[PDB]
Amino acid sequence: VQLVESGGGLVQPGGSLRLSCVVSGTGFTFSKSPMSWARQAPGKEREWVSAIFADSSTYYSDSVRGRFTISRDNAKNTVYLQMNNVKPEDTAVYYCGHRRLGKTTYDYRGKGTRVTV
Amino acid sequence: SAPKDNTWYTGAKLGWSQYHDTGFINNNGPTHENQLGAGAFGGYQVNPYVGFEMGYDWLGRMPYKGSVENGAYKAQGVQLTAKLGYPITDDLDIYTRLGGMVWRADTKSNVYGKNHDTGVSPVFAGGVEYAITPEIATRLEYQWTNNIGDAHTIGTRPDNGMLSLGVSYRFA
Ligand SMILES: CCCCCCCC
Ligand SMILES: CCCCCCCC
Ligand SMILES: CCCCCCCC
Ligand SMILES: CCCCCCCC
Ligand SMILES: CCCCCCCC
Ligand SMILES: CCCCCCCC
Ligand SMILES: [Ca+2]
């Protein structure tokens, strides 16, 4: 399983930005794969932020609820994180994780993409 | 006593099915491992101590309840076993059954969606059988079916223990 994040960059407070996570590799079925988004802000530990299941149900941390939107496009093996009304607290490197059958945890295998508010 | 030599019989059973080692998803609600099992079986008796029986088993649907992650597991199969027993009394026999079950297991969850797999599991059973009449026999047994699934295909591989009551008709 290979994960590549993209879309990060400079944004003003209140702005919007969409991140993308493209999943590739072997031994996995993306349509059945639950995915997640986490972030690590400067001087803080990594914080889980969002998750999307195989049934397309979505989940969010309180810190981003109502502002961030996770979505998936199974035709392109891609997960998106649409970020609206960004705060200085949203400045972080964002990582996407892939959860395997048999594990309750997500594997954050990507290099990440940095957002700077 | 056992069915007559070289004679056939048919039967059905109901039971308390209980799954074990049910790790699957991180559901925050109840997991109901206890379910109603059901099966039908037919058999051929070789001698008073040895017989062969074949049957279908419905092992029940196990729900994984929860507010976030939730799902369910289901299993059924066809089995073939050798029945070995000897008498406690002229009408009450004690026996064991040894063999295998070809099973289909299905899982449903929001986390992983719909998945299913097929495979083989060994069957170990022991019980007692009482001859109510020359044609009718009742049985009480515990049946263990090992490793029904696969972590990589459906996310779980539970065991099943079933305590069942059964009735069979002998055509001798
Ligand atoms: C929770 C279901 C148990 C039913 C047991 C019935 C045994 C014949
Ligand atoms: C865990 C409760 C199961 C009910 C058992 C009934 C005995 C036949
Ligand atoms: C009660 C015995 C079960 C078999 C009935 C189903 C026939 C296909
Ligand atoms: C041999 C017929 C017994 C009835 C249940 C079906 C066997 C798989
Ligand atoms: C013997 C009970 C039938 C339950 C449904 C099993 C077939 C999918
Ligand atoms: C007492 C019933 C015999 C089958 C049990 C096998 C070990 C779980
Ligand atoms: Ca086991």
* C-beta B59 within 6 A of ligand 5: no
Are residues B68 and A104, on separate chains, in Cβ contact within 8 Å? no
Residue B8 near residue B169 (C-beta atoms within 8 A): no
Contacts of B26 (CB under 8 A, 6+ apart): A104, B66, B69
- SS3 state at A89: helix
Q: Is residue A92 part of a domain?
A: yes
Q: How far is B100 from chain A (nearest CA, A)?
A: 25
Contacts of A66 (CB under 8 A, 6+ apart): none
Q: Is residue A73 part of a domain?
A: yes
The span from the CA of B129 to the CA of B96, in Å, is: 11
CA of B56 to the centre of ligand 3 (A): 9
Selection from B61, B77, B80 nearest residue B22 by Cα? B61
Q: How far is B23 from chain A (nearest CA, A)?
A: 8
* C-beta B167 within 6 A of ligand 3: no
Identify the residue whose tokens are 């060994």.
B122
Q: Is residue A69 part of a domain?
A: yes
Tell me the CATH class for B7-53+64-170: mainly beta
Q: Is residue A107 part of a domain?
A: no
Q: Is residue A86 part of a domain?
A: yes
The span from the CA of B87 to the CA of A18, in Å, is: 75
- CA within 13 Å, CB half, A75: 0
Partners of A98 on chain B (C-beta within 8 Å) are none
Residue A66 near residue A58 (C-beta atoms within 8 A): no
Identify the residue whose tokens are 């027993």.
B85
Ligand 2 environment, Cβ below 6 A = B 16, 34
Are residues A34 and B152, on separate chains, in Cβ contact within 8 Å? no
Q: In chain A, how many domains are there? A: 1
Q: Is residue A44 part of a domain?
A: yes
Q: Is residue A51 part of a domain?
A: yes
Sign of the alpha-carbon torsion through A57, A73, A82, A89: positive
Identify the residue whose tokens are 């998750």.
A51
Q: How far is B105 from chain A (nearest CA, A)?
A: 15
Residue A55's CATH number: 2.60.40.10
Picking from B110, B115, B153, the nearest residue to A55 by CB comes out as B110
- Chain A positions with Cβ closer than 8 Å to B: 31-32, 34, 53-55, 57, 59, 99, 101-102, 104
The span from the CA of A81 to the CA of A97, in Å, is: 12
Selection from A108, A73, A103, A65 nearest residue B111 by Cα? A103
Beta strands across the sheet bearing A68-73: A2-6, A17-24, A78-83, A68-73
- Rounded to the nearest angstrom, the gap between the alpha carbon of residue A22 and the centroid of all alpha carbons in its chain is 10
- From residue A58, how far is each of A97, A113, B10, B33 by CA, in Å? 14, 21, 51, 27
Residue A50 near residue A62 (C-beta atoms within 8 A): no
Beta bridge partners of A68: A83
Q: Which domain covers residue A28, as residue numbers? A: 2-98
Enumerate the domain spans of chain B. Answer: 7-53+64-170
Q: Is residue A12 part of a domain?
A: yes
Identify the residue whose tokens are 């400067």.
A42
State which approach was used to obtain the coordinates.
X-ray
Task: State both tokens at B62.
Answer: 């196990």
- From residue A100, how far is each of A48, A70, A95 by CA, in Å? 17, 19, 17
The span from the CA of B165 to the CA of B13, in Å, is: 6
The neighbour count for residue B8, using CB atoms within 10 Å, is 15
